[PDB]
């Protein structure tokens, strides 16, 4: 017995306003922040793995790998300065998840992003699994110290082009991100082992589902749980050498192919939330402009 009456956005919206849809998990990646000015990996030329020649790395991926960072942290901090945004304005997609929170539907947002825009949009620590960590806080790397430093401190170090050193022990201070090759936080595994017991909808947005173990999250929901992908490209399908949008067996997965902001706007409109979402985004962006 399948829960969606049809494998379309309109079917997902009718399901969301049925009594059965009480707990929504969002799984999000870099595609929800490109319209906020943070580049993803997939975009041609503007992806973060391009335009790295100046750094003289052994291979492009080394800039985000923990072994290399440990020996040579300077390239990463130079890239961070180049990418640091003038303003942190969450996107329409971020504010759609704020609405899910406000309306009591959001069980959890699992994010691969480190850019802090979920928190700025008003998602609380309880609402979030920052699976790959965050720039919001940083720590001295010495095991016997671990002094914490805020983003305002780390930003000044990044822009002054001074490698951040701990004021207590002079060790390196590292943003609280999970580099490739580092263990994910315990919170990721503990939330993953509880949240998917009775989730009613997975909303997957702005990710290619190529980084593990985050990508395995789509497989943790019950087999009946609908899964909606809002993304520029179809993602999460089994490799011919997972999501089933198109087979004769397809029964619960829906792909809306386009910009995350436009997809969330379309879904909001079907739900009767379009004015609420427009008003929220305009008010939040105006407030961010005013506080500057």
């Amino acid at each position: 017995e399948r829960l969606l009456d049809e494998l379309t956005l309109e079917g997902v919206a009718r399901y969301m306003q049925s009594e059965r849809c009480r707990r929504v998990i969002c799984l999000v990646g870099a595609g929800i922040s490109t319209s906020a000015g943070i580049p993803d990996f997939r975009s041609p030329s503007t992806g973060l793995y391009d335009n790295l020649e100046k750094y003289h790395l052994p291979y492009p991926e080394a800039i985000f790998e923990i072994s290399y960072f440990k020996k040579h942290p300077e390239p990463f901090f130079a890239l961070a300065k180049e990418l640091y945004p003038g303003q942190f304005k969450p996107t329409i997609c971020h504010y759609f998840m704020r609405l899910l929170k406000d309306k009591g539907l959001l069980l959890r947002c699992y994010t691969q992003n480190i850019d802090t825009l979920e928190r700025i949009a008003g998602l609380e620590q309880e609402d979030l699994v920052e699976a790959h960590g965050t720039f919001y806080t940083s720590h001295c790397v010495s095991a016997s110290c671990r002094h914490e430093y805020p983003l305002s401190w780390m930003k000044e170090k990044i822009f002054s082009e001074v490698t951040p050193k701990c004021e207590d022990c002079q060790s390196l201070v590292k943003p609280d991100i999970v580099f490739f090759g580092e263990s994910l936080p315990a919170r990721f595994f503990s939330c993953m082992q509880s949240d998917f017991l009775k989730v009613d909808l997975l909303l997957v947005m702005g990710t290619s589902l190529q980084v593990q173990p985050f990508a395995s999250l789509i497989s943790k929901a019950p087999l009946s749980t609908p899964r909606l992908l809002i993304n520029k490209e179809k993602a999460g399908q089994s490799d011919p050498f997972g999501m089933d949008f198109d087979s004769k067996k397809a029964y619960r997965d829906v792909a809306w192919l386009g910009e995350c902001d436009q997809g969330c706007l379309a879904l909001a409109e079907l739900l009767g939330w379009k004015k609420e979402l427009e008003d929220l985004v305009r008010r939040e962006h105006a407030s961010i402009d005013a506080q500057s």
Partner: peptide
């Protein structure tokens, strides 16, 4: 150690 981030 907990599972590591890999592409």
């Amino acid at each position: 150690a907990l599972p590591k981030k890999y592409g």
